[PDB]
Design a binder for this molecule. Structure first.
Ligand SMILES: Cc1cccc(O)c1
Ligand SMILES: Cc1cccc(O)c1
Ligand SMILES: Cc1cccc(O)c1
Ligand SMILES: Cc1cccc(O)c1
Ligand SMILES: Cc1cccc(O)c1
Ligand SMILES: Cc1cccc(O)c1
Ligand SMILES: [Cl-]
Ligand SMILES: [Cl-]
Ligand SMILES: [Zn+2]
Ligand SMILES: [Zn+2]
Lengths: 30, 21, 29, 21, 30, 21, 29, 21, 29, 21, 30, 21
């Protein structure tokens, strides 16, 4: 897996594939 | 924050899954 | 099962532009 | 839901905004 | 909508969805 | 410039539509 | 109407790499 | 146009360059 | 020939997240 | 290969990792 | 073509279309 | 390195094809 900052759509995208069927929650900044 | 853990600092895979449903 | 999996790709990305800071859930089923 | 609805027909930004928060 | 700099393909992509059926014009730098 | 209004500075939605056909 | 709408996604993005600074129009109809 | 032509068959970079400027 | 060409788009991108630094080859045929 | 296998059915990250290095 | 730094998935993506049928090799950092 | 030639410095098209199979 990437040792990189995932910063945007890339963050989401990543989550998208990491999580897959499970699904996910994106809060953005907190 | 996923953003503050994976954008402001690098994230591992594990570290990402924390944020799955 | 791709064409909904490749579709979703786009949805999550566009849900990101539109939802700005409010955030979203992506799940179904 | 979003996928039946937006992966069959084109959701505009407006329709997509529905699935925020 | 995002309070963010949209910087590239992201710019285009954005336009793509903001505009939709209308369509768009991308000049790039000017 | 869309670039100079939305890359060098942040852009609103409205501000984006300026650039639709 | 997605599969031309998801397709286009890609076209606009690739028209961006290739057209560099010249720019493009994206419209039809 | 581009969509009939490139969304049916694969446009290479070269074909795509046609719809610049 | 798109729907494998638009598909691949995604594969190369996801092969990028997953393969990190090891790298990949993308080819067939 | 990857395309027959992942463009027909959804490859998870794990399956995809197979085609690294 | 873009006179720009191509930095990630964008790098790959680019390669993807530049190379096409030929295909490609991504080493990442070296 | 493609990365060091096209990320750390700008790359031309040609310069990219160097990295095709
Ligand atoms: C539509 C759907 C069902 C289940 C999980 C998901 O991430 C998406
Ligand atoms: C923006 C977008 C992407 C994919 C499908 C849709 O209905 C809408
Ligand atoms: C092909 C097409 C028609 C109309 C509007 C668009 O943005 C694209
Ligand atoms: C680069 C690209 C994307 C999608 C369709 C095409 O014909 C070409
Ligand atoms: C599946 C496939 C065949 C030939 C070339 C490619 O880049 C990909
Ligand atoms: C991540 C991904 C994208 C496209 C097809 C797949 O099987 C998997
Ligand atoms: Cl697609
Ligand atoms: Cl970026
Ligand atoms: Zn796609
Ligand atoms: Zn990016």
């Amino acid at each position: 897996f990437v040792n990189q900052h995932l910063c945007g759509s890339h963050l989401v995208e990543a989550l998208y594939l990491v999580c897959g069927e499970r699904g996910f929650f994106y809060t953005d900044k907190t | 924050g996923i953003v503050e853990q994976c954008c402001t600092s690098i994230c591992s895979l594990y570290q990402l899954e924390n944020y799955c449903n």
